[PDB]
């Protein structure tokens, strides 16, 4: 049959309807006693100009098409070259949109900081008026303004404590919950495995059919999936 080769497109878009394909064949080199790969670039006809640099293609022998062209593209085995072209165009649009959004979020942050620098009022001073007015009874209009600078309509000892909250405090509680879950899951499964009877019951209670007839790994995974379905789904 017609001689067919597999190769990588190494040049495209330089000649009209012609691409350069790199074909590698296996040969034996008697001198060094080693089976080597021999490489050759083929000028190949691309009637539809579909192939792109980087594509893996199969080329088939044809009639003479020019001084040096004797093969044509017969199939695109892998279209990595075509993918490269599509992803580059999308990237330009995708990145422009993201950069526009980030540029607007930077100017907004700058405006807020500039606005705050125009308000001579300071947190410490404001928190020293909400704690003196709340301990003296005075209600100068500054407080009403302070009830707008911060949004704190009510001036109580439990409102300054909520104006000065630090994110670290929230992190400290999320971390304790995370540690609890892991510790509970491990103790639960550890105990369950120690008692085969309580384990068999555990599985049946959660909806396993004849858990007794199961393997150690085929069933410990069920136990693990259940212990993690009784401490993460209920919570």
């Amino acid at each position: 049959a017609r001689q067919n080769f597999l190769g990588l497109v190494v040049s495209q878009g330089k000649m009209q309807k012609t691409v350069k394909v790199r074909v590698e064949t296996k040969v034996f080199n008697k001198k060094i006693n080693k089976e080597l790969f021999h490489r050759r670039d083929y000028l190949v006809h691309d009637e539809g100009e579909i192939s792109r640099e980087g594509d893996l293609v199969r080329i088939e022998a044809t009639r003479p098409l020019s001084k040096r062209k004797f093969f044509a593209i017969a199939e695109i085995i892998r279209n990595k070259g075509q993918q490269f072209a599509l992803y580059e165009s999308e990237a330009q649009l995708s990145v422009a949109k993201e950069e526009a959004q980030k540029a607007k979020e930077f100017l907004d942050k700058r405006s807020v900081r500039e606005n705050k620098l125009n308000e001579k009022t300071t947190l410490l001073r404001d928190i020293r008026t909400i704690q003196d007015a709340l301990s003296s009874g005075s209600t100068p209009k500054e407080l009403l303004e302070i009830k707008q600078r911060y949004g704190i309509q009510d001036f109580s000892q439990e409102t300054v404590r909520q104006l000065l909250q630090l994110d670290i405090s929230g992190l400290e509680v999320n971390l304790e919950k995370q540690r609890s879950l892991i510790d509970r899951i491990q103790t639960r499964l550890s105990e369950l495995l120690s008692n085969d009877l309580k384990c068999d019951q555990f599985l049946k209670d959660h909806g396993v059919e004849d858990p007794l007839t199961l393997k150690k790994n085929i069933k410990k995974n069920l136990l693990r999936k259940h212990v993690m379905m009784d401490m993460q789904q209920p919570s």
């Binding site: 009637e47 539809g48 044809t62 009639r63 098409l65 044509a72």
Partner: protein, 53 residues
């Protein structure tokens, strides 16, 4: 797309029908011609042997 001016498929294999090959190559004489001549008789014998072979 295959190259313009080229056949997409390979030419069909030509299978020989031995009955048709024999009929066209070594066909039998259509009539039993009168080979009274010495040279006609020799030619008839040679043609018969060649056709048999």
């Amino acid at each position: 797309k295959h190259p313009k001016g080229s056949h997409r498929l390979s030419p069909k294999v030509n299978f020989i029908d031995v009955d048709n090959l024999i009929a066209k190559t070594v066909a039998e004489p259509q009539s039993i011609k009168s080979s009274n001549g010495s040279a006609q008789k020799v030619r008839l014998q040679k043609a018969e042997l060649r056709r048999k072979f």
